[PDB]
């Protein structure tokens, strides 16, 4: 359950911890594996830049 | 008319069509078969075809 | 008297058992004005449930 | 110089990253005269009236 | 002794791989397994049968 939530009016966008905790894009994460391969897609696109 | 219907008719109708409602279930549910999930969006559950 | 219909009793049924389907009245509001549609999954073509 | 600077805008809009490199060291933004000069109000971006 | 190392089983032996990913084999993906482990020894052995 990371769903991730965009950015509104300037504000940064936000994914969710995994203690409900919604954070955003920068510092530093850890992802199993899994993870990317649910959301190839859709991580690639909000993550890459 | 053709849009219309018989408001005293309801109950008579509504009735047989519960009955129909019935019928056309009347079925056994046949068992197919199945694949183990090869993804991780399941731990490996097994899917049915 | 010598011989009556019998009657169909066994039927199988492979697919699914239910009675009742979700249809979409109103499509969505994809694009838009606000949300980016890269946002929203049907954009990247996932099938949902 | 070379200056990279936003749309305001007068209603919710998703956000989205923007990778900058000059910017100047004092105010120099006094040519702008109004932002959205024909909506109620400016929600995104550099508002002015 | 191999199989038993990628579905569970209570065969005791002792387990070194452990640590590189591996799902839960079904009976079905066992199968398939068991017949390289079934080629793989026939062909280096030069049976046909």
Redesign the interface.
């Known amino acids: 359950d990371c769903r991730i939530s965009f950015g509104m009016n300037g504000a940064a966008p936000m994914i969710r911890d995994e203690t409900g905790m919604m954070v955003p894009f920068e510092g530093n994460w850890i992802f199993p594996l899994a993870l990317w391969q649910m959301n190839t897609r859709y991580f690639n696109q909000q993550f890459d830049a | 008319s053709v849009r219309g219907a018989n408001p005293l008719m309801f109950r008579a109708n509504v009735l047989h069509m519960l009955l129909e409602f019935v019928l056309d279930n009347l079925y056994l549910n046949r068992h197919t078969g199945f694949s183990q999930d090869h993804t991780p969006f399941t731990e490996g559950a097994n899917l049915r075809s | 008297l010598l011989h009556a219909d019998t009657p169909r009793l066994v039927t199988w049924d492979a697919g699914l058992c239910t009675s009742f389907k979700i249809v979409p009245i109103v499509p969505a509001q994809v694009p838009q004005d606000v949300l980016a549609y890269t946002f929203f999954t049907s954009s990247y073509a996932i099938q949902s449930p | 110089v070379p200056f990279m600077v936003p749309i305001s805008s007068d209603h919710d809009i998703s956000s989205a990253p923007a990778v900058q490199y000059i910017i100047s060291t004092e105010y120099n933004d006094r040519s702008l005269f109004c932002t959205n000069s024909s909506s109620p109000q400016t929600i995104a971006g550099p508002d002015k009236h | 002794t191999l199989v038993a190392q990628i579905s569970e089983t209570q065969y005791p032996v002792d387990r070194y791989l452990d640590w590189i990913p591996s799902?839960?084999?079904?009976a079905?993906?066992a199968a398939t397994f068991a017949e390289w482990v079934n080629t793989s020894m026939k062909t280096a052995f030069d049976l046909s049968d």
């Open positions: 799902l839960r084999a079904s079905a993906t």
